[PDB]
Write a protein that binds this ligand. Structure first.
Ligand code: K
Length: 227
């Protein structure tokens, strides 16, 4: 196999996610668990707002809350930066601009802790409208899909990406979220820097009928393409 970290994703891998957030001074934490099967590009995750009521819409946190689980086709194995940085991991940073509203700034570490792939994230949101689509909770909760456009960032021994999410507004149009992303390896080992390509990602959101806490169940597929 073309990286050593690739070998860690051949079977089902357990996942943990920990997020601390602050959006316009509304603080919150989210804890997630589940598993990923990179063979199929398949993620099954469940998140709990551990601070009680989430002050932003669940759909707006999906992209922040493990692209190492992408399915790369055989012909594209040399373009998988994410697995190549494992097990030491990578830093993933974003700015997410919500059109006509505020932005999220995120910093995460994605790495193995024992046998578990752990995503630890700090999120800060500023300049939101208290009655806009985000803090006013005006988004639909269901499904979204888009493409993550990835390019190499050789100067940082990593990658960049950008993409746009169209979040449906309930009885409305969409709320756009323009994402800009950077990833850099945590370790000193060699990594794979890719040619331009994209991750086709579909995120289906649901509720656990036995869960009384504020929560999100996510079923997601992530597939590399474009080469
Ligand atoms: K909502």
């Amino acid at each position: 196999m073309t990286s050593k970290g690739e070998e860690l994703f051949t079977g089902v891998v357990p996942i943990l996610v920990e997020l601390d957030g602050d959006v316009n001074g509304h603080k919150f934490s989210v804890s997630g668990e589940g598993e990923g099967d990179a063979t199929y590009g398949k993620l099954t995750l469940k998140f709990i707002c551990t601070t009680g009521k989430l002050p932003v819409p669940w759909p707006t946190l999906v992209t922040t809350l493990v692209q190492c689980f992408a399915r790369y086709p055989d012909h594209m194995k040399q373009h998988d930066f994410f697995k190549s940085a494992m097990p030491e991991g990578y830093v993933q940073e974003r700015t997410i601009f919500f059109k006509d509203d505020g932005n999220y700034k995120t910093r995460a570490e994605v790495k193995f802790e024992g046998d578990t792939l752990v995503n630890r994230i700090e999120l800060k949101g500023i300049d939101f409208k208290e009655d806009g689509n985000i803090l006013g909770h005006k988004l639909e909760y269901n499904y979204f899909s888009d493409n993550v456009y990835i390019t190499a960032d050789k100067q940082k021994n990593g990658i960049k990406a950008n993409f746009k999410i169209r979040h449906n507004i309930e009885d409305g149009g969409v709320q756009l979220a323009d994402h800009y992303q950077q990833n850099t390896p945590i370790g000193d080992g060699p990594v794979l820097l890719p040619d331009n390509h994209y991750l086709s990602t579909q995120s289906a959101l649901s509720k656990d009928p036995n869960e009384k806490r504020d929560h999100m169940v996510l079923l997601e597929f992530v597939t590399a393409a474009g080469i």
